[PDB]
Amino acid sequence: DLPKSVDWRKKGYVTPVKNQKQCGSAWAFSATGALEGQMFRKTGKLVSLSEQNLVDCSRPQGNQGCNGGFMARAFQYVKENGGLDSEESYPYVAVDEICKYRPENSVAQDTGFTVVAPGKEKALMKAVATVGPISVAMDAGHSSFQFYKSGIYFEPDCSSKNLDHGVLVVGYGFEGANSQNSKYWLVKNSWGPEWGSNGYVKIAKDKNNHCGIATAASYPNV
Ligand SMILES: [Cl-]
């Protein structure tokens, strides 16, 4: 059945780490990271997508730009809008601006999104293994996360229910030889390559949905 490990970065599904800077747009980076991987799966072409397009244009769907938002509202906006522009055509500036969506510059589409059963790490494992990178929310409100550097992240004060940060699960794995021991979720952050481990963090896997990684997972349908 399911592989002992997955890493979509090794198959060309993931763009290099990005930096949201001083703007609460992590939800937008998480949504573009999931759409980048589904579009790569569908066309074989990896194209960086515009977080700014989401920040400026998805207020009608319930997002609030640099004040926060949700990946599912972003996929709903891509669906209702009929498209989403490339990173190159609609560059990121980390401030709320006027919607400048240009259909001629669109390089992605989705028909809606699929939800992972909430709180179910095994359902999340199956989604990651068979679909590609998955958008997820997590409790990142801790100094231990801010200064994380390496190893399997584990924070006693983490919540599986009150989440404040959107990220992207690009795979899962384990340390050592036993595939069922010291497992982790491979997670792409949006605080620059300089943060954490080359912009990534290993989050403890199958330890009671630590930090809520499987509480609100979803992926776009392309
Ligand atoms: Cl969401």
Author numbering: 1 to 222
Task: List sentences quoted exactly from the publication behind this structure.
Addressing the elusive specificity of cysteine cathepsins, which in contrast to caspases and trypsin-like proteases lack strict specificity determining P1 pocket, calls for innovative approaches. Hence, we set out to determine the crystal structures of cathepsin complexes with representative peptides of cleaved substrates. As a working model, cathepsin V was chosen because of the resolution of diffracting crystals (up to 1.3 Å) and crystal packing with accessible active site cleft. Reactive site mutants C25A and C25S of cathepsin V were used in structural studies.
The pattern II group (binding shifted to the non-primed side) consisted of structures of nine protected peptides and one non-protected peptide that all bound uncleaved into the non-primed sites. Electron density maps of the peptides enabled the unambiguous interpretation of residues from P3–P1. The nitrogen of the amide protection group at the peptide C-terminus was bound approximately 3 Å away from the ND of catalytic H164. The amide likely shared a hydrogen bond with the deprotonated His residue. At P4 and beyond, the features of the electron density maps became weaker and less precise; however, it was possible to model the peptides KPKKKTK, RLSAKP, GNYKEAKK, and EVCKKKK up to P8 in the averaged kick Fo-Fc omit maps. MPD molecules were bound to the primed sites of all structures. Peptides from patterns I and IV bound to cathepsin V consistent with the observed protein cleavage sites, whereas the peptides from patterns II and III did not bind according to their cleavage site found in proteins. Their binding appeared to be biased by the absence of the negative charge of the reactive site Cys, which caused a shift in binding.
